[PDB]
């Protein structure tokens, strides 16, 4: 079994910056994960793809986010971070971390972000 | 006299034996096996009873489909691999059956463009692969830079958020994803720029060059090592959450340590569960589980127990460790039922109340339960050691059909073997290595074809009619070599590394007793050749 | 829908699996196993009969105790070993918890004295060893010369003239020897100058430094390699000369070659004995054997035979090859008893007299005897080959508990193994050898502790939750490596010699039929990485 | 007290175990084993029934005899082999026990004559071979040119056109060929100049030098590698074409794919045949097959089925794949016969007419047939895998007697082993290699003799009392070596590559349960010697 | 199973020449055969030995044929030939090819030769 | 089974010398024995240790015998000897040889010595 402990949510005014984090138990090494990432829920929508690492060296970002946010990982801490700069009111919602290893899948309890 | 003529004539009737090409498994399908366990002692356990059981497991409903991979090999010396972009797949591969001589790659973190033999950009035709099977068909531009196209099997299991390719690689996108109204809500881990869906797509075979007679919706996805494409279809309708895995003819239940422990002679797994039944009817709307559990229990009872045992009550349900659900109906043999009758005169509720009756039953059934457990550990110990020596034979024996297998750590990887007709196989006249005089092949060299008009493929004869694509089994050449190898319902005899003749299985002696051998065996005397 | 949530929650429940540290056996305990034998033919033997038996063997009454070894290591380059004298054990090790830096040794047949780094004679305190188990505790001065103290298991068996240490070494003196009145007559092979007994001794733990609350009598002995000490206690009172080894549910007896031959399905051995009963009652004063033989025979008869057979007469006794005694009670089935009754109308005495009845029985039972014998040879042949491949698994399966084993020639050496809780084990992130780039470990590296606050010990993951202290299983670093290793109920997945994640046992497919696999398997296609 | 004296006394009475010299098989006798099969599922087959069966196979009537080989070894450096001419065999070997120092051979396609130490042509006397057994006697001139004479076993099978020698070589001439009236018509592949028959021949034993008391007719043949000679005798009178191979206690029969399929629990081979019976009575003049089939079927019926089943009709005959003929008698159980009786109330002809009765039987028996297949495949998979690890043990277990075996590809070669009395064997005091200090033997060195006054042969102790003639099993010498090897009904203990003592089999602990070991085992602790 | 395709028979006047051939199926390699050869039947006798190769390098001929006929083999064509010269009326009869590998034996359908 | 053939007993006046010997069957090699030796019985006592070799290279002697007697072995003859010099009346008794290999023990039939 793998546990994803999520942290770094909150509230800031427009143009502010945040840094979400998702740390994993020893039973799942993030640097070896097949696909890691952050997904956003909005009041009228399903889970949108925000930012992910779909191969140990690849990267993906939503069109409406590309250039503002940045995803990264730390193999020593076994944690991943989503640096979010220059936030907009539209960035408001519930963010959920996800990590999956060769068919095994895991979701974190989504943290709230509001602008 | 005459009988020998009939026997000689019948001895020509060879068995319907076939050859098999067993490719090495990639790990796209792995299976586990049981490990011997701590066997309990007879003093342990209480409330022993016998009954009929039906075991169910989570229904994952596998969805198998065909997918095509497109990629470029680059060698510059410096080996690299790259995906074929959508524009090249649609406008050149599907439209005309050709690839560009050019290929983008990365060296020292910088983008670079390779060219076939340093020539200018030009179209190159795709030609079918030589060694490829009729099923896993493929094509390539050569035999630098080389374009490759391969059709492979793919599998997705519930919830269908991903799929695995026959190469062992995963794709973190649902096979049902697409721009359609009911599809853009499916799972995907990739940016929108990495996926493309084409409506009204007309395929063109890279062999016959024939264009398809009907339109389709084709999905394309760019992975950092290849692009994958597959035909989109709407999601399959839902099915029952569990599948009937086993019908257990006799299953002993006992309370041990505040938990029920189930066991039988056939099922090598001893299910463990809580003492309280599960509320199945609240979730089993439409009786997906109830209908099958009732039908099977009644069928098994009628088939055997009908005249010798009595049903205690209605079927019960319990959830066990792992993904299992056990439907169970306890029974009382006629001879045991009479004991309860004679004590009652001084119905299910009575079962565990007569302490003196249950004390006898706990020992009687405890005897059997421990016997089965010790026996199963002995079988598992032998079977698990043999599995390491020959996984192909043990996977095939377990499954009851030929399969290719590999040990992959402590879990077995498996795949299907391709049958080859015996008339399509030819054995080579010598097993000496021409270029390395001190060495010889360990088993006969062969030439074969999957189809009656296909090209001849060079290989080596493996164990029990297996055909191997790599001529790698070798030995130092030793004097006095003699060997009989199994070959298509008979044998093939080699002497001093050279082929001599074929034998029918009837030309070799079959052993059964010492009397058969005492009249045939000799005190062999080694001649020590020069 | 909802049922999958319950299954997903139940899938979190892991089995009560544990790790085991199995150290290599030293040969202090060796066990034999049966060898297949020349099976007799059905025409052989006469006077066949069935019956109940109880097999007894010589009661060796093992006496297990704990002994402390004390010795000095010397390296000068030139490696040597020496015993600690009694004065140093009593006046420095027990009194203060220290050893002298000096150590007497021999080179070129002359006595010499070593010192720590050539320094002057100084006292040095002992520190507990890092790798030592909670039971087999030990201490040392360093980490030249080094003082060592170790507590080990010891065993003595009847008549108690010697004892063996857990190191595999013997001591040719009785554990009960001493200057006390009833002890100065026990066995000893050593001169009086090599032994010392201390009455009113008070121990002091080399760990807690706590001195004992009550006096004891401690024996000390000087062997040329080490001194041994143990707490003296008066000899245990006598016990029955034979012990009940096996209770056989059924046993056939037949006269063959002027001797009885006993055999059953359960007992893999067969007992040969004379046709004359042993006069047990003259020696079995107090009925140690008689009482148990009568109780067991009646219990087994009541448990089964009571409703279908009749006892021929009173129990008999026979002595067989090896250390065995066989109590036996022949039986007659009711259907066979009727034949004797009708043939009398023309009672143990009748049995082998009716040639016409016995001729049928000799063949009818001979059929069974030969069937069991041929079957046992088949099982022994398979089990004995598996034993050579994996003695740890075969020893554990035979005994029904985890044990460590070595093949030591043609006899198996065995030892107990230490359990380790799954939360005290950590798996390392890489399988590559840092100092040797072309080499990798074949199985995962680990770090663990025997107790929750103990120091971390470096090891390697063996087969089936075994933990090995030596990181020595190696391989050349081949490409495309994927492996699943058993690890605490679940599995641990490694890819390209790097740790990635842990799986539950439910995350891997379990096979039972070809139907289960035809819907899941794929025709695997290797991708051949660059 | 006294009882231990009796056990101590009986513990000396070790079993009548013996040693065996197992020479390597040459391939003159090869045997096959069964291969696993993909058997049909329960829904398959029709018209299931049960009955008694008697399986016969082609009577090959092996004819074993003694042949003598004569040849010259030549070394000139340049190794060569040549046959002895008839004149030298008759006028020097049989006349005086001597050979000519000269030997004709061919080098670079030219004839050349070798001489012993380049000396003139002189007579050399034959001395008996040192290593040869009492059965396969041999003689030679030396220990260049060396005259050799060897007596070997030979075998011929119907039609007796050829014979094979114990060396594995064939002779393409009938053992019965000769100039005599009824013999000059037998088979021969050789020109008349290569064969000679001597009437009134009187043999002269090469060891005792005694000339035979009676005349004989001796055949001599010159093969390019050696001359062979044997005593001619008129051809054996004819025998019936088939021999009774198996009396099958219970056999099921089913119709599948327009062919009958037979199966049983005992017979691992499932016979296949046409639905039409064979016209046996037209060919079996004198009822050699008929009489035995009727007699054996009645034996098995009377022995078991007599009270529980009814015979459907007279025995039937079928010819199957390979060399087999199956006599068969279908049966109906008393409880099944009642269904046919009650269905008639609304006799072989009825069996397959009542569709509803047969529908029940097809499933009821199909259940058993499939269970036996799955079980037999599991046994074959384990047995065939063990066979590769130890062919000597698996061959001996299969046959029920000690035999020497070798794998020879996918077909096992076999030969007889020579027994040696335990008092004729001596174990050497050390197992170190004197000339190679870093190397030691893996198993003990021995010295033995086949007969009480024969010369001592040097060898090595193999597994389970086997004696090997080549001291070739080696290992690098290691510290802390301890081993127990099986040796004549007991064990032999070696420590640090040196012999120490022998143990009775009763001196080693025999395993049974964890309770027996928990009182004996210790937590073994390594001492790591310097 | 092995099969021998025999050919080259016919009628030739005294003093002429003729050549028999016996080709074998791939299942039996003549070059490795233990004994190969030709046998003649005549009205008054059983099968006479005519010419054979009784070991992979040793030829054998009947006395009345020695130096007149010649036996040879071709490992590429898996075929053997019997070259006959200086034919006599006495050579008239039915010739049968035979090949045998380590106990397995095979006979061809005899071809007629007449002078 | 192992057997110890004991010899060399007898009688001599004070100040004399004797040489006891104990030869063993091939089934037990004395030079590899864990403990070898001689034990004496007297009218008033159990078996007293006289002289032993308690490891393949270490000796032991009774206090009243040290420097007066000597124990030695011959690996070729598989025999041990007890050289007795300067005998005294107190040396009178029944001497018994003993040899033991790793738990297997053996005793010889005691020889008499008297002064
Ligand atoms: C065996 O089963 C019986 C029930 O069939 C158990 O008996 C019940 O135990 C509880 C707790 O003591 C009582 O409240 C009930 O009144 C009992 N029911 C009956 C019908 O007697 C019994 O506990 C089980 N055996 C064990 C070892 O737990
Ligand atoms: C074939 O096997 C039989 C046993 O089934 C062997 O029979 C023995 O033969 C010798 C010599 O004729 C007799 O002295 C014995 O009395 C026979 N024993 C039995 C039990 O009948 C026979 O030795 C074997 N054949 C050969 C050639 O050795
Ligand atoms: C089978 O057992 C019977 C005894 O129950 C044996 O018969 C005895 O044989 C001896 C020696 O001939 C006679 O003195 C006795 O009078 C016999 N006793 C009876 C009661 O008949 C018989 O020998 C045994 N079978 C075999 C093969 O030895
Ligand atoms: C099962 O066995 C019966 C015979 O015992 C087969 O029935 C016969 O079929 C032929 C061909 O149609 C008819 O000519 C006969 O009249 C039938 N005989 C009887 C007694 O009914 C039947 O075909 C077999 N079943 C299968 C599947 O082959």
Numbering used by the authors:
A (entry chain d), E (entry chain e), F (entry chain f): 1 to 115
B (entry chain C), C (entry chain A), D (entry chain B): 90 to 165, 180 to 246, 263 to 465, 500 to 683
Which of the paper's sentences describe this entry?
The best conserved among them, glycoprotein B (gB), is essential as it performs membrane fusion by undergoing extensive rearrangements from a prefusion to postfusion conformation. Here we report a prefusion-specific nanobody against gB that is neutralizing with cross-species activity. We determined full-length high-resolution cryo electron microscopy (cryo-EM) structures of gB in its prefusion and postfusion conformation and describe the nanobody epitope and mode of neutralization.
Binding an epitope spanning three domains, proximal only in the prefusion state, the nanobody keeps wild-type HSV-2 gB in this conformation and enabled its native prefusion structure to be determined. To support this hypothesis, and to show the cross-species activity, we co-expressed wild-type HSV-2 gB with the nanobody in stable transduced HEK293T cells. gB is a type I transmembrane protein, presenting the ectodomain at the N-terminal end to the extracellular space and hence during expression into the endoplasmic reticulum lumen. We then determined the structures of the prefusion and postfusion conformations of HSV-2 gB to 2.85 Å and 2.26 Å resolution, respectively. Even the resolved part of the ectodomain shows considerable flexibility within and between protomers, as evident in variability analysis showing a lateral translation of DII and αC of DIII by roughly 5 Å. Notably, in DIII, the N terminus of the central helix (αC) forms the same loop as seen in the proline-stabilized gB. By contrast, the reconstruction for prefusion gB shows the protein bound exclusively by Nb1_gbHSV, indicating that binding of the nanobody is limited to this conformation and also indicates that it prevents the protein from transitioning into postfusion. The structural model built in the density for the gB–nanobody complex shows a similar interaction network of hydrogen bonds and salt bridges confirming the cross-reactivity of Nb1_gbHSV.
